[PDB]
Enzyme design. Structure first.
Site, short mmCIF file in Angstrom:
data_model
loop_
_atom_site.label_atom_id
_atom_site.label_comp_id
_atom_site.label_asym_id
_atom_site.label_seq_id
_atom_site.Cartn_x
_atom_site.Cartn_y
_atom_site.Cartn_z
N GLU A 148 0.79 -1.25 0.00
CA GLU A 148 0.00 0.00 0.00
C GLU A 148 0.81 1.29 0.00
O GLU A 148 0.69 2.12 0.90
CB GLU A 148 -1.15 0.01 1.05
CG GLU A 148 -2.05 -1.21 0.99
CD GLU A 148 -3.53 -1.05 0.68
OE1 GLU A 148 -3.90 -0.14 -0.09
OE2 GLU A 148 -4.30 -1.93 1.13
N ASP A 149 1.62 1.46 -1.05
CA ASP A 149 2.48 2.62 -1.26
C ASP A 149 3.63 2.79 -0.26
O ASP A 149 4.17 3.89 -0.15
CB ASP A 149 1.67 3.93 -1.49
CG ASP A 149 0.83 4.01 -2.75
OD1 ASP A 149 0.78 3.00 -3.51
OD2 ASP A 149 0.20 5.08 -2.99
N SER A 150 4.05 1.71 0.45
CA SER A 150 5.25 1.82 1.27
C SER A 150 6.42 1.18 0.51
O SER A 150 6.19 0.56 -0.53
CB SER A 150 5.05 1.27 2.69
OG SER A 150 4.59 -0.07 2.77
N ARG A 191 -2.48 2.20 -11.73
CA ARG A 191 -1.85 3.49 -11.99
C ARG A 191 -1.49 3.72 -13.42
O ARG A 191 -1.59 4.87 -13.86
CB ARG A 191 -0.64 3.73 -11.06
CG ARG A 191 -1.09 4.08 -9.65
CD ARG A 191 -0.01 4.35 -8.63
NE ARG A 191 -0.16 3.50 -7.46
CZ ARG A 191 -1.09 3.66 -6.51
NH1 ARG A 191 -1.94 4.68 -6.56
NH2 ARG A 191 -1.17 2.79 -5.50
#
Ligand SMILES: [Mg+2]
Ligand SMILES: [Zn+2]
Ligand SMILES: [Zn+2]
Ligand SMILES: [Zn+2]
Ligand SMILES: [Zn+2]
Lengths: 263, 114, 232, 379, 65, 203, 46, 335, 56, 84, 43
Positions: free
Chosen positions: D52-54, D223
């Site tokens: 999650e975007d880490s 994305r």
RNA sequence: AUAUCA
């Protein structure tokens, strides 16, 4: 001879190419890990700055001084200051380095790892010498000064391991491969048309027999034979990266046996 | 700021043994050794060697969380055999294997002229 | 160690009555005893920060050294041949073993039924070397002699570890010993406690003794500040 | 940068020009003054610390100087003149004749009321000593921000347009990439560090190469940031070839073109490389998309964000907790939060938040006219 | 600004190689890719260190005090 | 009585046993295991008069009284934290509370500003080997940084032949390839010299 | 010995006290710096 | 609107959030510094007296320590400065304002807060590093990610308040939500991706790894399941070793397009007695789905059991995928 | 009503109409800082000396 | 007005809110050194004590259940079914 | 610094949208997210 | 007040 066997392929001051047969992958790896992380080295750890007229920050410079490789041949006869009995440091536990530089020249004056001088008593042991691999014999370029640019500082180098800081890492990249023909089926090759055409053949393919399609899958087959390359930074000679690595892991295991013994 | 000291990875804490051997409740002749200030380097090595022992029924290790340098190793052996002894033998075998590895490297290195 | 206590006093004339009362109340006659205490403080010539290696505040305190002396060292010639009993008080190489104590100011609290003081103690058994005198040893720790006092009195052993001391105190100096207790005796009742229970039980014992002497002699909790040996 | 006194200055230790560049950057002075470093980036699922975007950072690389930065804050102070008589002063206040002193230490002040440059400071410590005489005098000193620390870089003394003595103090720190520290590629692919792993724990190529950064496959699909993947492939070729990788917009460069060039270098054309697990040494069943990608270090760092409070300064009017991290404020248990508590049925938890944990006060009211009229001389 | 000692990814000393690289380009006219490789910088992690460096220090020196 | 302490700097946890066996044909019996704590304190006084050490050693013997000897500038102070070791007279007159603690606890909790504990070496599960008129104690010393060495405690009632006894043990050390070791039999009251010997051999 | 303040441009040391005149000796420029502490600063090389 | 209906508060804390595969669903990683600031006022009682006295002794700087002592008298003792911070002798009824400690119930919240699930009660877990760590499956209710999001923490001050949190708004209770009468938390990202990969017919695991995968399950019976393949070479399937996380009694049936009792395409789902019979585990099975493995588990076994299952499924799956690996490249866009 | 949108124009009218707020809404008790009459506070809790003396 | 026990019509089962509040209240009282109506089988946490008291229905509390009109039904914790 | 010296403000039909007339004059990508989106043009 | 953060 006995258990696991070595067969060196190439040697230099900086590299060891070899083949490790009759070994567990787990063992090959555990050795690989130790070489990277647990072998002790000497590296600058405290930097007292008396003067700095440079374009660079006190700590910017300080940081670099840690990354400068120092002779760690006789590192084993030096104590970790933590274990040493003094107040801060001493001879039994540290190497004191000095650096005084000034822009006398109208042209840019350079500061090198060669410009470091040992001020502590070495007890006649191979330690703290800035490693110079440089052709021109200068070593690492620390700084650049112009005219009235002065840099006066003091370094305390201490025994340590790469786990505490990567500066005490005696090894550069360690190459590690096994089964250049995927005989073990340890990878499922991603492809578009043909995995054989698409994926480049390893160097080590030459040191193993191609599988020959008209044969069933060897499930019984296990991973032994590891094609490795150990690269040294300078602190310790290439061979001793391997040896000390083998020894550290051995000592590490002994501690467990001993722990059980005290229990 | 909330960053732990780097030596905490290898340097034992105040009153903290390397080994803590606790017995497994759920299974007969099974034990759980917690190794403080240790990682995969040692865990996977020991686990793999215990696997070679025929009298060893179960062996696995796990680093429960990466912020802490410690691992739990669970050993189960056949009745009569002691898991502490199993661990002792695997530890020994490893050393003896490494001893030969060093000897063999040393011999081979000395033969090189570079 | 936790010392729970209560104090009181009586004038010289109240002696016999008090001795008679405590003898009946406890079942035993008094026991004569003495002790010499020497107090030491951090050397003022030396100066150190007042903080830990962990940079935590440490308060400078006095160290108390205490031992006994043979009674014969306290009886001159005029004192000669006088029953060596409770009545005597009216007519008033290496180091030896010592008791070394550092105490804390009593526990805080309004309406405390007793005084409660923490005491850190260790025992000095002997010495050897160049400077083996207890004095040198104290200096080696960074301390200097400040003052010293002699205490002579009688004690009573009672139930549950309760002890009662009837004492007289004299400060000692070449200029002369002066009786801090001139006029009468300092009365002390206490119990030494190495769990909350035993602490509330000990308080009760002291409270029952206070209750049993109410009307005759009063025992109370002294001022915390009067039991604080910190240097300042 | 070294000759200017600005509030806040962030400078990257070892900036790198990008391996993948635009023809337009020539004019933008970007290769001369860059905003990031070319990191060795693996797009892989590893310990699940990059979900999650880490992202995962090579703690080994961080030590070697990857993404470190200099930090300079500048504190200012005036010696104001309040009319005919009252004048503030630069000096080291003495605690006996000076009111409302800061709990911080004043020892690092020379008698001119300033710290000499070179002294290391820390939270709550007094950089500039000032008093506003009024009668003996109150303390008007400047302490270093409590959430920061470092070494004093430079200290200058001056007079202004009308000649009021005023002094500027620069403080230098070196910020070494930590956990909640934000980074992004040039493709709107942002994230914070989830964990930092040492080189041995990291997955590795047979060649001995290890990632500096591990980013999650789950980023890419939803994305549709294809140029990120191309940037990488091209940057990999660029790094090997030693030629500037032209990542310019409308061109005749194809993913096929770059693929061919990478195969010429010995690597598998689509950028994949077989990786070995760091903990076991066992080959990964998957082959990892691996190569350099230009990553940027962003202004949002966890330590300048982190804040906690438990009783603190209160406003004068409302007698409620003050605002913002800066002022050691309390957080807002706002309207929408009241709602959730009401939804939960946490009657007593709500009462506490609104009373005990904030505002709560006691008045005396009249039983006849239910007013706060009562002259309670409660004593 | 100022050549990194040691490659971030593997830690091969790269501090000595700077002037030598800059020399193999002016004096030897050689292309960047050969000079890097001459200097033994084989892994791309090491290559990127020198190839993508911006020695800002040299501008910084242009200011007087 | 007489004593001597030998500290084997260069050694491993195994060295103990190696030396243990070189005596296998000299042994007689083995008494209960022993223990020992060796602390080093550094003085924080900054005016310290020239030539006054800043170092003080604390040697705690376990069930040698649970006694602790303080050593500084060639002088020693013997203390005990054992209520059972309190001279009866001190308990009777109230000089003592009857409940003592360790001098080290006092140092670290009441005098910590003046004295800071620098190092703590511990020796657990030591071995008491009984030979001919010579008792030899062996224990592995450990610090907060792993193994620190091997310690040999030599106690002999026989006031006579001793210099020989010590030389003999040093010989068995030559056999097990234990080179580069320190030996002390110096003196400044038995417990005191013994304590002093540890200091000489370890400092 | 002792250089209380330094000059910004000409870099000539100044050593002045309170109410001495905030300016340099030769050049005009009222800029002026502070010169490093003589209490030498030590840094960890990590 | 701004001083009464909502107001800022004390015992609040805020920082950058980051995920953790090693935290339990209902816990929250609390940075040491944050724990050392936030306080709980505990009443001195026979039960805690000794413990409390120790934290008091520990003081404001040590982790499990305390900041203040509140006497009956009403006046507050500051352990940071009180000359009596050492020799502080507690009395029943006094209050020790002690640090927030592992397993304290705390309100965790991500603003906006358009949900009751946007504020949930978590178990404290004091950890290093400056970020609030959360279990990945709890991401969805809060609507959080780790692109630079910050979250709020509120600490209850009463035994009553704590009960409210633990008994009404704790994370496990919140799993099945009334919003849409289905689970509001499911398996995500790595664990979802790895779960498909693990549960294919093709997927077989060797003994070595099976033992680690088993040991990784914190409630594992100690029973090594009989391999699906016993000779040539003992081999276990993904389905098999995942089923160890699935509790007994759990019954599930799902037919997807073309599912037969012979599930040729490894379609749909069939879990009998908490053991997978057929089909590949993915979003429809292990996600925040109406028919879900989670929906059944919460409902059949309990919220506390289901919360454990999240951790379990992830500890196995993540471990497996750590060693299997998974990537994505330009080659994946190429047709 | 005043906690949403019309605030002051609602409180003036509240004044001239001599309104009486019975404080049953959650809003009121929140403004007043009292335990709201919602879930946990929707009932009252009493000790019974009967049952109390029964258990001992 | 108070509804007679024989005319009570609210649930014979304890509400989530009731149980949370009883546990909260007892735990609070237990924590304020109130007398505990159960054998603490080594228990020290007042909530775990509260849970235990409610488990054996040895909690001497009564729920006054208010009806929208103002009337109420009183229910003992001993008499309320705990199916939660 | 560069992009700040090329910033455009538009105070107060459909202004936020990228118009065809913005071709070659204003950047189609450089605009804020939220409130000022498409009202802050970049040359 | 502008800028910004999710
Ligand atoms: Mg986000
Ligand atoms: Zn030393
Ligand atoms: Zn009225
Ligand atoms: Zn490299
Ligand atoms: Zn000038």
């Amino acid at each position: 001879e006995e258990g696991p066997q070595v067969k060196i392929r190439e040697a230099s001051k900086d590299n060891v190419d070899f083949i490790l047969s009759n070994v567990d992958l787990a063992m090959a790896n555990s050795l690989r890990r130790v070489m990277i992380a647990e072998i002790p080295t000497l590296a600058i750890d405290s930097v007292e700055v008396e003067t700095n007229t440079t374009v660079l920050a006190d700590e910017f410079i300080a940081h670099r001084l840690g990354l400068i490789p120092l002779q760690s041949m006789d590192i084993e006869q030096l104590e970790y200051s933590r274990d040493c009995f003094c107040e801060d440091h001493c001879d039994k536990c540290s190497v004191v380095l000095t650096l005084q530089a000034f822009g006398e020249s109208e042209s840019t004056t350079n500061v090198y790892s060669k410009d470091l001088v040992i001020v502590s008593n070495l007890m006649g042991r191979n330690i703290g010498h800035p490693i110079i691999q440089d052709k021109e014999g200068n070593g690492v370029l620390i700084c650049k000064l112009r005219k009235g640019q002065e840099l006066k500082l003091t370094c305390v180098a201490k025994k340590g391991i790469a786990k505490e800081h990567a500066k005490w890492g005696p090894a550069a990249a360690i190459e590690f491969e096994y089964d250049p023909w995927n005989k073990l089926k340890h990878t499922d090759y991603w492809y578009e048309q043909d995995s054989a055409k698409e994926w480049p053949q390893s160097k080590n393919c030459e040191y193993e027999d191609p599988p020959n399609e008209g044969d069933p899958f060897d499930y019984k087959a296990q991973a032994d034979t590891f094609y490795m390359n150990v690269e040294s930074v300078g602190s310790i000679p290439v061979d001793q990266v391997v040896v000390r690595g083998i020894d550290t892991l051995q000592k590490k295991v002994a501690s467990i046996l001993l722990a059980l013994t005290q229990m | 700021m909330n960053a732990p000291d780097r030596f905490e990875l290898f340097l034992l804490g105040e009153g903290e043994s390397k080994l803590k051997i606790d017995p497994d409740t759920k299974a007969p002749n099974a034990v759980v050794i917690t190794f403080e200030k240790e990682d995969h380097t040692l865990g996977n090595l020991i686990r793999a060697e215990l696997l070679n022992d025929r009298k060893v029924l179960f062996a696995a290790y796990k680093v429960e969380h990466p912020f802490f340098a410690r691992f739990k190793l669970r050993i189960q052996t056949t009745e009569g055999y002691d898991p502490k002894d199993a661990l002792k033998n695997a530890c020994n075998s490893i050393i003896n294997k490494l001893g030969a590895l060093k000897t063999n490297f040393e011999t081979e290195w000395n033969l090189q002229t570079l | 160690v936790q010392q729970l206590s209560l104090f009181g006093s009586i004038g010289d004339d109240g002696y016999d009555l008090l001795i008679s009362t405590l003898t009946t109340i406890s079942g035993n006659p008094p026991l004569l005893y003495n002790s010499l205490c020497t107090v030491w403080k951090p050397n003022p010539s030396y100066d150190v920060e007042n903080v830990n290696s962990r940079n935590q505040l440490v308060e400078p305190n006095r160290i108390k050294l205490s031992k006994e002396v043979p009674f014969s060292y306290l009886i001159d010639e005029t004192m000669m041949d006088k029953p060596l009993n409770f009545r005597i008080l009216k007519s008033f190489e290496s180091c030896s073993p010592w008791s070394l104590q550092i105490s804390d100011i009593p526990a805080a609290g309004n309406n405390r039924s007793v005084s409660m003081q923490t005491i850190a103690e260790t025992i000095i058994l002997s010495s050897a070397g160049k400077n083996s005198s207890v004095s040198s040893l104290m200096n080696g720790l960074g301390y200097v002699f400040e003052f010293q006092y002699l205490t002579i009195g009688v004690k009573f052993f009672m139930k549950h570890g309760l002890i009662l001391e009837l004492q007289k105190i004299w400060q000692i100096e070449e200029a002369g010993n002066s009786q801090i207790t001139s006029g009468g005796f300092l009365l002390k009742a206490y119990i030494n406690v190495s769990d909350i229970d035993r602490i509330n039980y000990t308080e009760t014992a002291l409270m029952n003794l206070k209750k049993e002497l109410q009307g005759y002699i009063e025992l109370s909790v002294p001022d915390r500040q009067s039991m604080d040996s910190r240097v300042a | 940068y070294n000759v200017r006194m600005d509030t806040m200055a962030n400078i990257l230790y070892y900036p790198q020009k990008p391996l993948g560049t635009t023809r337009a950057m020539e004019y933008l002075k970007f290769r001369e003054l860059p905003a990031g470093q070319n990191a060795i980036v693996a797009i892989a699922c590893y310990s699940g610390y990059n979900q999650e975007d880490s992202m995962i950072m090579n703690q080994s690389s961080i030590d070697r100087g990857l993404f470190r930065s200099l930090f300079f804050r500048s504190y200012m102070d005036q010696e104001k003149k309040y009319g005919m008589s009252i004048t503030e002063t630069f000096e080291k206040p003495q605690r006996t004749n000076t009111l409302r002193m800061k709990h911080g230490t004043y020892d690092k002040l020379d008698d001119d009321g300033l710290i000499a440059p070179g002294v290391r400071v820390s939270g709550e410590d007094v950089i500039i000593g000032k008093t506003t005489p009024i009668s003996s005098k109150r303390d008007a000193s400047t302490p270093l921000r409590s959430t920061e620390n470092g070494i004093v870089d430079q200290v200058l003394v001056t007079t202004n347009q009308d000649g009021l003595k005023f002094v500027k103090v620069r403080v230098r720190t070196t910020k070494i990439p930590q956990i909640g520290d934000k980074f992004a590629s040039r493709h709107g692919q942002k994230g914070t560090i989830g964990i930092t792993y040492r080189r041995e724990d990291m997955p590795f190529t047979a060649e001995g190469i290890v990632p500096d950064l591990i980013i999650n496959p789950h980023a890419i699909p939803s994305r549709m940031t294809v140029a990120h993947l191309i940037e990488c492939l091209l940057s990999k070729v660029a790094a090997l070839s030693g030629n500037e990788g032209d990542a310019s917009p409308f061109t005749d460069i194809t993913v096929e073109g770059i693929s061919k060039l990478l195969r010429e270098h010995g690597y598998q054309s689509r950028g994949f490389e077989v990786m070995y697990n760091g903990h076991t040494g066992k080959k990964l069943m998957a082959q990892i998309f691996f190569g350099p990608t230009y990553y940027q270090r962003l202004r949002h760092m966890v330590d300048d964000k982190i804040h906690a409070r438990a009783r603190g300064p209160m406003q004068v009017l409302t007698r409620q907790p003050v605002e913002g991290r800066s002022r050691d404020g309390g957080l807002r248990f706002g309207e929408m939060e009241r709602d959730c508590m009401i939804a939960h049925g946490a009657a007593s938890f709500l009462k506490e938040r609104l009373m005990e944990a904030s505002d709560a006060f006691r008045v005396h009211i009249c039983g006849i006219c239910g007013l706060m009229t009562v002259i309670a001389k409660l004593n | 600004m100022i050549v990194p000692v040691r490659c971030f990814s593997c830690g091969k000393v790269v501090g000595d190689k700077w002037e030598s690289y800059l020399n193999l380009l002016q004096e030897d006219e050689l292309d960047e890719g050969t000079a890097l490789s001459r200097l033994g910088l084989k892994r791309y992690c090491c290559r990127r260190m020198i190839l993508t460096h911006v020695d800002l220090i040299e501008k910084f020196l242009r200011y007087n005090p | 009585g007489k004593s001597a302490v030998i500290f084997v700097e260069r050694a491993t946890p195994a060295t103990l046993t190696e030396l243990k066996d070189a005596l296998s044909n000299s042994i007689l019996s083995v008494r209960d295991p022993w223990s020992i704590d060796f602390r080093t304190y550094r003085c924080s006084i900054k005016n310290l008069p020239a030539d006054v050490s800043k170092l003080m050693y604390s040697i705690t013997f376990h069930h040698h009284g649970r006694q602790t000897v303080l050593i500084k500038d060639n002088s020693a102070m013997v203390t005990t934290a054992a209520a059972a070791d309190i001279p009866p007279a001190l308990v009777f007159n109230g000089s003592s509370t009857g409940v003592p603690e360790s001098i080290d606890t006092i140092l670290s909790s009441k005098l910590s500003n003046i004295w800071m504990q620098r190092q703590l070496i511990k020796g657990d599960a030591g071995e008491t080997l009984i030979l001919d008129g010579l008792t030899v104690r062996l224990v592995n010393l450990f610090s907060s940084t792993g193994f620190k060495g091997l310690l040999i405690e030599l106690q002999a009632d026989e006031a006579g032949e001793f210099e020989t006894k010590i030389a003999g043990i040093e010989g068995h050390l030559a056999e097990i390839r234990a080179k580069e070791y320190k030996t002390s039999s110096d003196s400044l009251n038995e417990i005191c010299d013994l304590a002093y010997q540890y200091v000489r051999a370890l400092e | 010995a002792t250089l209380k303040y330094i000059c910004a441009e000409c870099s000539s040391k100044l050593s002045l006290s309170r109410t001495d005149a905030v300016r340099c000796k030769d050049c005009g420029h009222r800029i002026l710096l502070k010169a490093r502490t003589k209490r030498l600063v030590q840094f960890e090389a990590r | 609107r701004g001083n009464l209906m909502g107001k800022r508060v004390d015992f609040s804390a805020r920082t950058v959030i980051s995920g953790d595969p090693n935290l339990e669903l209902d816990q929250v990683g609390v940075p040491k510094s944050i724990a050392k600031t936030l306080t709980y006022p505990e009443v001195v009682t026979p039960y805690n007296i000794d413990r409390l006295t120790q934290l008091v002794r520990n003081g404001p700087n040590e982790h499990p320590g305390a900041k203040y002592v509140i006497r009956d008298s009403g006046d507050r003792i500051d352990l940071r400065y009180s000359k009596r911070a050492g020799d502080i002798q507690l009395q029943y009824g006094w209050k020790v304002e002690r640090h927030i400690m592992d397993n304290d119930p705390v309100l965790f919240n991500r603003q906006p807060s358009l949900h009751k699930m946007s504020m949930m009660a978590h178990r404290v877990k004091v950890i290093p590093y400056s970020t609030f760590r959360l279990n990945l499956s709890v991401t969805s209710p809060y609507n959080a990610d780790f692109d630079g999001d910050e979250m709020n923490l509120h600490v209850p001050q009463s035994e009553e308040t704590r009960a409210e949190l633990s008994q009404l708004c704790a994370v496990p209770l919140q799993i099945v939500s009334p919003q849409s009468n289905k689970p509001c938390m499911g398996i995500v990202q790595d664990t979802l991706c790895g779960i498909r990969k693990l549960t294919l017919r093709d997927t077989f695991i060797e003994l070595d790894q099976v033992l680690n995968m088993l040991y990784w399950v914190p409630d594992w019976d100690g029973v090594i399941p009989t391999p699906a393949i016993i000779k040539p070479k003992p081999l276990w399937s993904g389905k098999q070793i995942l089923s160890v996380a699935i509790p007994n009694g759990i019954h599930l049936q799902r037919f997807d397009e073309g599912t037969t009792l012979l599930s040729p395409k490894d379609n749909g789902m069939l879990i009998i007695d908490g053991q997978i019979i057929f089909g590949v585990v993915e979003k429809k099975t292990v996600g925040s789905s109406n028919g879900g493995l989670i929906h059944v588990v919460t409902r059949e076994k309990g919220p506390q059991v289901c919360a454990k299952l999240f951790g379990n499924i992830q500890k196995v799956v993540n471990f497996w995928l750590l060693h299997n690996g998974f990537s994505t490249g330009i080659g994946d866009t190429i047709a | 009503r005043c906690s949403f949108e019309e605030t002051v124009e609602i409180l003036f009218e509240a004044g001239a109409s001599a309104e009486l707020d019975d404080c049953r809404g959650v809003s009121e008790n929140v403004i007043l800082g009292q335990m709201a009459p919602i879930g946990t506070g929707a009932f009252d809790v009493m000790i019974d000396e009967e049952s109390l003396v029964k258990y001992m | 007005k108070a509804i007679p026990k024989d005319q009570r019509a609210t649930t014979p089962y304890m509400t989530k809110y009731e149980r949370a509040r009883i546990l909260g209240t007892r735990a609070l009282q237990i924590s304020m050194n109130a007398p505990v109506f159960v054998d603490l089988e080594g228990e020290t946490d007042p909530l775990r004590i509260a849970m235990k008291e409610l488990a054996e229905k040895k909690i001497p509390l009564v729920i006054r259940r208010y009806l929208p009109d103002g009337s109420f039904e009183d229910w003992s914790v001993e008499e309320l079914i705990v199916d939660l | 610094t560069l992009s700040h010296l090329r910033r455009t403000n538009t105070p107060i039909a459909k202004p936020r949208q990228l118009h065809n007339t913005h071709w070659g004059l204003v950047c189609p990508a450089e605009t804020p997210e939220g409130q000022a989106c498409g009202l802050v043009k970049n040359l």
